[PDB]
Write a protein that binds this ligand. Structure first.
Ligand SMILES: [Mg+2]
Ligand SMILES: [Zn+2]
Ligand SMILES: [Zn+2]
Lengths: 34, 46, 196, 67, 49, 192, 258, 115, 49, 51, 147, 240
RNA sequence: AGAGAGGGAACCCACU
């Protein structure tokens, strides 16, 4: 189902997933890689 | 007269000479680290 | 909710951010496409029925705090400040002494400023967990008092505690490297390391 | 890096509390319960452990240059 | 051999790509370093976008 | 010397208790903001139906813009006045403003009651996107919140859109400060 | 024209702190006694650190700093020690110093904690205070080591904060401000002190113009270098000694003028 | 660099007088007592004790600068009564009450530790 | 640098979420030098075929 | 002088116990670069004791 | 003194003076400030976030948890922070009765106190102090050197 | 080229002839100090032990200057240069034989500057004449320029990392000129708007506004503590 | 007891 009011802790889970997958310097590394 | 250097990655020590190319004997690592001085140090604990 | 359930249990389900991108839940919107998108700020306010504003949302912002940079993310309550103050703090935050790197004992950096007892902030943001500011911090939590006094915190100055400083308060250490090599040349000038 | 020996404000000896603080944390206590289980009433002594980052454990991973 | 081109750290053609943090600490490189910079004559260079 | 040494006995501070007004003042501020917002909305609905008549000397869009800016400035002034009637004579913001040492009434109004309208180049926040200021607003939205008016104060904090518009205003101020210096110095050099 | 008679009433006495009340004395006397608690009480602390060898991740001066702030048991030796600069010895002796030796090398894969226990004194009485765990000086990886000799000398809190025996000296007079020295804007919001004696209906005591500060409440928590009561005894002795020396110089100056 | 050594707070030097008496010339029976290498932790008590005399018309003290370790205690007493006498009586009164306080603290310790 | 105009330096509306609104060098390079936002990502580009 | 560049130990005075290196020396006094503090201070030759 | 410190809100400033612990003011308990900042730095700069950080720091250091300071929360306003601080035996708005460090008489005003997060900037005064007197001289023209 | 060497803001005419590098100048951060007069600047010792004033040997000061020369250099009270009658410089930092350390009337002694010496204190954007004023030297321990609070307003220096430039007038004639023209007491009222530029700065202003209120009353001890700090007090406690 | 110093130009980041 949906996240009615535990959204405050649910959004930071996806933020953590993004920054564990990508990182802070994906621009430089991916640009030089391509 | 020879100076003792610590062989970087090897962490072993060896002698060195004047006008001697800087090489370790274990694996020829180029980076040497000079040993700590033998004279006394005294620190005010402040 | 199932996405959150599979996303909390990372390193077990191998459910990454890329899997959520593949699931058609999030997508990357660039600046051209922002001109033709109806963007919800937060879901708890802009999907519930009210005196309706638009009721035609296409995308929703993940979290508004992600509009800020890396140095504006370490500011506690940056929306309560004034914007020039936030800019000046963004300037100063790239200048605070601290453990700039973990292997600083190996690096022969010029002008290495490191600190004795850096601390994580008691008042932190959620975004510091992703800049890893709690692992290589820059600054110490200090018991400040905002008081007029003898007259040495007059015009943008602060009175410090001598005993606290003697207890290692902000006592930093400054490293400076010096490099020099000799030059084998055409025998006219020949540098060599020796005690003169 | 390593835990300060004294609280900056008080001078209360807090350097001997860090390992016990970690033990109380891994023994399923709250941080507030662990602090006053160690006996830290003043919040200036509480911030010394509550906001410390034990960075020296990161520095001990590297092999010592001198040996 | 055409020539040597610089490599920014933590790339897919750097030595320490995908290495574990223990391996990085064995190489005297910290896992905290994000890379993305070139080492030119020992100087760390950043290509500003 | 002697006033500092008396200040040692007296002591002077500033805090978060000096930035909070009683709930009656907050109710007054919120009522004024709501009334002004509804007034702006009804002015907008007059402008849509061509019932707004143009002031002699400018276009209809500006009769409208003058009306909106007038209403919002009146709201800012009224909320500031109603905020600065509730210091209770011990508020340190009033202590510094009345003495004239640091600050003014505008700072008190912005901290306690409302930041006010944010401006770029003397007018409201322009439509950077296609006929909207930010992608969160519907197109052709000439309301207070869409065009840069901030109804929150520094005590309550700004919503992200208000934060961005406030950052725009601060950027304009910093640009002015950074560009003024060289021209002023050159004028001084020529004059001397 | 003379000094009032003060009196002491001790509410509790623990190995950490002492809590007492001093009545019938002036405010300046009470504040000075607090300041002499913080500063003028001499204890024994490490001040001369000679690093024979060091391979730890922490540098030499960081280790010397951490050795400075370690409290030492000086309950009875500090009264016998001369100040180091006042001694006629050959720049160090057991009459103005206490010798400590640290000699630790880590020969195991476990992280070896060089604690305060590894500090070995030649004087059995002057030992580090550490039931409680030891004070962590430096952690050691395998292959690292540190050897040092540290001389501790007598000093007080004005010189450096490592000679401060007190963890915290709480001091307050008139907990319900009948003197009205502090003026609350809204006294209802203000929590009562530990020594307040007003009922929960009342916020603060009525004002009296003829009153004066008296009945000062102290909470002197020691850091372990001294027992909390010998801190007070040494403080009173030190303040009396300072006044006596001031009187002696005063007598010399008066005799010089006449 | 320019950090004063930590012993500048309390240690005198050769050619430094601990106490210097300068007779004031503005009003009769007034003296400035310049105490070297001291702070408020002496002058405050001396001032408070000198205010308890019924024959001291003015009792004050100030530090010229917190970075320079000296205080000046200004004493104006009633005529027929020298300010130096008031000073040397204030010191004795302070010593008396402090010794009495120390003895009473000893008695309190003996009461508390022995029940 | 050193231009008396303001339009290349101002905080445009389309800087929302892509670039930080607060962080900038406040010298003579206000608005010109910017710092990227957190979740903002520069598309590395692919072939249109 | 002979004392120049000689590790000395202040054996008398307020700075007693400090190890330093003599930078300048005279008949009366000598400047000592202290190993502990970031400061070079001058003391009498009668107060110095070489290692 | 002269060393340049700064908050996390653009509230920079050099060290004016350093008092010892006995000269620094103190609360009813033994807590003295580590830093004492100017009250006049607030009203014109309008860093209310600094005050809120101080209040949340008191709440966090008493509660035993690292406080949350995300900008756009709506779950943490100043009133909730004050209500959480009131439970730990403090004033609602973080004010605390400081006693004077010199005279001992309690300060008439109630000083706002609490823990913030201060940053020491790279800028010392030893790196910036320099004097000169007929030292090195340029060769192109006989004027003193630069830097 | 030569035209490029002359035409610039870094050339010969502006860059070298108009604004040139000068000896006898110091630059360090300023920190506030309310315990010294408005015409006093608290300079560090290491700055005062490096900037010298050429004092002429006269029979009035021959013993004092002789003692300062006996101290030599780095004994703060000391000097570093002693200039002969024929313009010959003799070092005091290199410790010559005691034979050529005499003083007769006519010698110059470049001695380290002490308390009471006059210096020129300025900030960078000297937009008016009160941005560059003369102060009296006070020797304070730490390594900053301790200057007063009310002089902030003409200087526009807010102590948040500001560093000032301190020039030393070398001649006695220019010292008297600075004392008689560019003293901050003589630069209180500006000619641009016939008003003072010093004023009373923030904290003193607020404390004096709260101080002079009607409901402010002072106990006798507090009154004596306050009157201790009046420099212009004739020693008479006013009637309450 | 043997006593002076030099580079120079270019370009980046901050500092008030
Ligand atoms: Mg400034
Ligand atoms: Zn090897
Ligand atoms: Zn001895």
């Amino acid at each position: 189902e949906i996240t009615p009011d535990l959204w405050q802790e649910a959004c930071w889970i996806v933020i953590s997933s993004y920054f564990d997958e990508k990182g802070l310097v994906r621009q430089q590394l991916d640009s030089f890689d391509e | 007269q020879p100076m003792i250097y610590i062989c970087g990655e090897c962490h072993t020590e060896n002698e060195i000479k004047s006008r001697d190319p800087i090489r370790c004997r274990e694996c020829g690592y180029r980076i040497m680290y000079k040993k700590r001085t033998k004279r006394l140090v005294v620190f005010d604990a402040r | 909710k199932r996405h959150i359930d599979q996303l909390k249990e990372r390193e077990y389900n191998n459910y990454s951010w890329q899997d959520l991108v593949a699931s058609g839940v999030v997508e990357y919107i660039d600046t051209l496409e922002e001109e033709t998108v109806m963007l919800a700020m937060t879901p708890d306010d802009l999907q519930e029925k009210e005196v309706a504003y638009c009721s035609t949302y296409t995308h929703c912002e993940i979290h508004p705090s992600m509009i800020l940079g890396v140095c504006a993310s370490i500011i506690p309550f940056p929306d309560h400040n004034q914007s020039p103050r936030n800019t000046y703090q963004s300037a100063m935050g790239k200048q605070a002494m601290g453990v700039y790197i973990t292997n600083f004992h190996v690096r022969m950096d010029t002008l290495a400023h490191v600190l004795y007892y850096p601390q994580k902030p008691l008042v932190t943001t959620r975004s510091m967990e992703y800049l890893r500011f709690r692992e290589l911090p820059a600054g110490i939590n200090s018991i400040v008092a905002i008081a007029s006094y003898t007259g040495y915190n007059q015009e943008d100055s602060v009175i410090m505690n001598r005993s606290a400083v003697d207890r290692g308060f902000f006592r930093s250490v400054f490293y400076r490297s010096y490099k020099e090599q000799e030059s084998k040349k055409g025998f006219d000038q020949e540098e060599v390391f020796e005690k003169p | 890096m390593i835990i300060p020996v004294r609280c900056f404000t008080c001078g209360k000896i807090v350097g001997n509390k860090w390992e016990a603080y970690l033990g109380l944390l891994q023994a399923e206590y709250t941080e507030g319960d662990a602090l006053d289980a160690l006996g830290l009433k003043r919040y200036c002594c509480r911030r010394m452990l509550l906001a410390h980052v034990d960075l020296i454990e990161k520095l001990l991973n590297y092999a010592p240059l001198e040996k | 051999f055409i020539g040597k081109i610089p490599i920014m750290l933590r790339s897919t053609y750097c030595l320490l790509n995908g290495l574990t943090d223990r391996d990085l600490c064995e190489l005297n490189e910290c896992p905290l370093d994000p890379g993305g910079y070139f080492i030119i004559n020992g100087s760390e260079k950043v290509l500003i976008a | 010397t002697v006033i500092n040494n008396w200040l040692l006995i007296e002591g002077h501070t500033i805090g978060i208790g000096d930035s909070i007004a009683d709930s009656k003042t907050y109710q007054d501020i919120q009522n004024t903001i709501k009334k002004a917002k509804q007034d702006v909305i009804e002015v907008i609905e007059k402008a849509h139906n061509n019932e707004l008549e143009p002031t002699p000397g400018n276009t209809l869009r500006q009769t409208f813009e003058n009306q909106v800016n007038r209403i919002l400035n009146d709201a800012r002034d009224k909320t500031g006045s109603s905020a600065q009637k509730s210091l209770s004579e011990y508020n340190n913001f009033k202590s510094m403003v009345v003495s004239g040492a640091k600050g003014s009434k505008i700072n008190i109004s912005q901290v306690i009651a409302v930041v006010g309208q944010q401006n770029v180049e003397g007018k409201r926040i322009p439509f950077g996107f296609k006929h909207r200021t930010l992608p969160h607003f519907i197109k052709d939205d000439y309301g207070p919140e869409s065009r840069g008016f901030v109804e929150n104060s520094y005590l309550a904090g700004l919503t992200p859109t208000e934060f961005f518009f406030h950052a725009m205003g601060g950027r304009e101020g910093l640009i002015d400060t950074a560009v003024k210096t060289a021209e002023t110095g050159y004028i001084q050099r020529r004059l001397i | 024209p003379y000094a009032n008679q003060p009196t002491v009433r001790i509410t509790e006495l623990t190995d950490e702190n002492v809590k007492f009340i001093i009545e019938n004395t002036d405010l300046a006397v009470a504040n000075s006694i607090r300041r002499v608690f913080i500063a003028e009480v001499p204890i024994i602390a490490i001040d001369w650190v000679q690093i024979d060898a060091n391979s730890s991740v922490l540098h030499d001066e960081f280790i010397a700093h951490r050795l400075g702030l370690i409290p030492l048991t000086s309950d009875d030796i500090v009264d016998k020690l001369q100040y180091s600069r006042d001694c006629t010895c050959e720049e160090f002796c057991p009459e103005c110093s206490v010798e400590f030796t640290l000699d630790v090398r880590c020969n195991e894969d476990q992280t070896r904690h060089v604690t305060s226990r590894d500090l070995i004194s030649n004087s059995p009485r002057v030992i580090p205070v550490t039931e409680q765990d030891d004070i962590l000086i430096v952690k050691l990886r395998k292959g690292q080591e540190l050897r040092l000799r540290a001389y501790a000398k007598k000093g007080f809190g004005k010189e450096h904060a490592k000679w401060n025996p007190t963890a915290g000296v709480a001091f307050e007079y008139d907990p319900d401000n009948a003197l009205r020295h502090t003026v609350y804007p809204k006294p209802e919001e203000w929590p009562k002190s530990e020594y307040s004696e007003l009922d929960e209906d009342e916020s603060q005591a009525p004002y009296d113009p003829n009153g004066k500060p008296e009945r000062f409440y102290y909470n002197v928590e020691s850091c372990g270098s001294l027992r909390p009561e010998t801190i007070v005894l040494s403080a009173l002795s030190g303040l009396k000694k300072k006044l006596s020396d001031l009187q002696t110089q005063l007598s010399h100056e008066i005799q010089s003028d006449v | 660099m320019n950090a004063p050594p930590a012993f500048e707070s309390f240690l005198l030097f050769e050619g430094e007088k601990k106490i210097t008496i300068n007779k004031d010339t503005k009003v009769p029976n007034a003296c400035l007592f310049t105490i070297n290498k001291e702070d408020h932790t002496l002058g405050n008590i001396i001032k408070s004790q000198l205010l308890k005399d019924p024959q001291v018309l003015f009792a004050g003290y100030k530090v010229p600068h917190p970075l320079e370790h000296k205080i000046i205690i200004r004493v104006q007493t009633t005529p027929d009564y020298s300010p130096q006498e008031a000073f040397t009586n204030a010191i004795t009164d302070l010593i008396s009450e402090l010794s009495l306080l120390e003895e009473r603290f000893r008695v309190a310790i003996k009461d508390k530790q022995e029940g | 640098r050193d231009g008396k105009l303001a339009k290349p330096r101002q905080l445009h509306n389309t800087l929302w979420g892509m670039v930080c609104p607060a962080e900038t060098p406040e010298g003579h390079a206000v608005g010109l030098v910017k710092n990227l936002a957190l979740m903002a990502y520069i598309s590395v580009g692919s072939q249109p075929s | 002088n002979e004392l120049i560049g000689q590790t000395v130990r202040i054996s008398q005075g307020p700075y007693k116990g400090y190890i330093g290196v003599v930078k300048d020396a005279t008949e009366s006094t000598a400047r000592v670069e202290l190993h502990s503090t970031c400061q070079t201070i001058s003391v009498d030759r009668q107060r110095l004791t070489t290692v | 003194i002269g060393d340049k410190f700064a908050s996390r809100h653009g509230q920079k400033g050099t060290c004016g003076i350093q008092y010892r612990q006995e000269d620094m003011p103190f609360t009813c308990e033994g807590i003295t400030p580590d830093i004492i900042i100017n009250p006049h730095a607030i009203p014109s700069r309008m860093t209310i976030g600094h005050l809120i950080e101080c209040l949340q720091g008191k709440v966090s250091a008493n509660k035993g948890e690292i406080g949350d300071a995300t900008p756009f929360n709506d779950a943490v306003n100043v009133q909730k922070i004050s209500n959480l601080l009131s439970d730990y035996g403090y004033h609602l708005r973080g004010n605390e009765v400081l006693y004077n460090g010199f005279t001992g008489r309690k300060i008439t005003s109630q000083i706002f106190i609490g823990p913030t997060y201060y940053q020491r900037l790279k800028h010392m005064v030893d790196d910036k102090i320099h004097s000169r007197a007929r030292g090195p001289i340029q060769i192109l023209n006989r004027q003193p050197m630069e830097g | 080229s030569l035209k490029q060497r002359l035409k610039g803001k870094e050339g010969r005419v502006r860059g070298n002839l108009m604004g040139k590098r000068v000896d006898f100048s110091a630059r360090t951060v300023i920190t506030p100090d309310p315990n010294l007069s408005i015409d006093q600047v608290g300079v560090p010792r290491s700055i005062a032990a490096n900037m010298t004033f050429a004092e002429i040997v006269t029979p009035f000061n021959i013993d004092r200057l002789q003692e300062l020369v006996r101290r030599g250099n780095s004994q703060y009270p000391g000097a570093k240069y002693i200039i002969r009658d024929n313009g010959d410089r003799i070092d005091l930092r290199f410790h010559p034989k005691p034979s050529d350390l005499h003083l007769q009337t006519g010698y110059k002694v470049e001695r380290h500057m002490c308390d009471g010496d006059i210096v020129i204190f300025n900030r960078q954007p000297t937009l008016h004449k009160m941005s560059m004023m003369g102060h009296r030297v006070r020797i304070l321990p730490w390594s900053t320029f301790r200057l007063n609070l009310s002089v902030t307003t003409p200087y526009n220096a807010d102590f948040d990392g500001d560093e000032m430039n301190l020039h030393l007038p070398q001649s006695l004639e220019t010292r008297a000129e600075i004392q008689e023209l560019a003293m901050v007491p003589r630069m209180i009222v500006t000619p641009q708007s016939n008003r003072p530029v010093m004023g009373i700065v923030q904290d003193t202003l607020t404390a004096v506004r709260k101080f002079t209120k009607r409901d402010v009353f002072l106990e006798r001890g507090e009154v004596m503590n306050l009157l201790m700090f009046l420099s212009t007090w004739d020693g008479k406690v006013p009637q309450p």
